[PDB]
Amino acid sequence: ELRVGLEESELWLRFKELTNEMIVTKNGRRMFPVLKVNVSGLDPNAMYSFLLDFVAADNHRWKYVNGEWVPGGKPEPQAPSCVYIHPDSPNFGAHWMKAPVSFSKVKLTNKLNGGGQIMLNSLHKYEPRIHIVRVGDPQRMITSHCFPETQFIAVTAYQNEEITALKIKYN
Numbered sequence: 001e002l003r004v005g006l007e008e009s010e011l012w013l014r015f016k017e018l019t020n021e022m023i024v025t026k027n028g029r030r031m032f033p034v035l036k037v038n039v040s041g042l043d044p045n046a047m048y049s050f051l052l053d054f055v056a057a058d059n060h061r062w063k064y065v066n067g068e069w070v071p072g073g074k075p076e077p078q079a080p081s082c083v084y085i086h087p088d089s090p091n092f093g094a095h096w097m098k099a100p101v102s103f104s105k106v107k108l109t110n111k112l113n114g115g116g117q118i119m120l121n122s123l124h125k126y127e128p129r130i131h132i133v134r135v136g137d138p139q140r141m142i143t144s145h146c147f148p149e150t151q152f153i154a155v156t157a158y159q160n161e162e163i164t165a166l167k168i169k170y171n
């Protein structure tokens with residue numbers, strides 16, 4: 001049976017209990033923590049691609065007021081459909097299953113200035129989503145997995161001083 005497990009779930013949850021934040025910039029910014037998954041129950045002989053996107057969690061934006069994240073207004077129109085292709089793609093099931101699959105190079109941005117970046121709206125909450133695509137499949141079968149532990153608010157600057165400190169500390 002196909003099983004996709006979050007790596008470092010305890011680390012993610014240290015950030016989630018503060019409400020996690022990720023910086024977006026013009027030129028794009030890497031995530032900490034990095035999203036990493038362990039995979040079992042692929043066909044080791046088959047070839048797959050791994051894709052990453054970010055799903056908008058709410059019909060509203062957030063604001064950090066008096067040390068509390070609270071609903072902050074109506075949402076911006078949805079960021080365009082951005083998908084990140086894992087740079088190991090396409091590859092054997094055996095390749096994906098032998099070691100955690102790491103999205104260490106994905107950059108989050110708030111300007112559509114290209115470079116395979118993920119466009120997010122500042123002060124909106126997003127949940128990472130991984131897709132497994134089988135190569136050469138006439139049915140174009142896809143699997144999609146969400147990672148609730150990894151939810152975060154996109155920000156141009158850290159709001160929560162505990163997040164700023166955690167980010168310097170564990171990284």
Ligand SMILES: O=C(Nc1ccccc1)Nc1cccnc1
Nearest residue numbers: 008010011012014033034170171
């Ligand atoms: O700090 C880490 N995990 C953790 C933190 C607190 C409690 C239990 C586990 N992992 C980690 C990952 C990547 C680089 N450095 C450290």
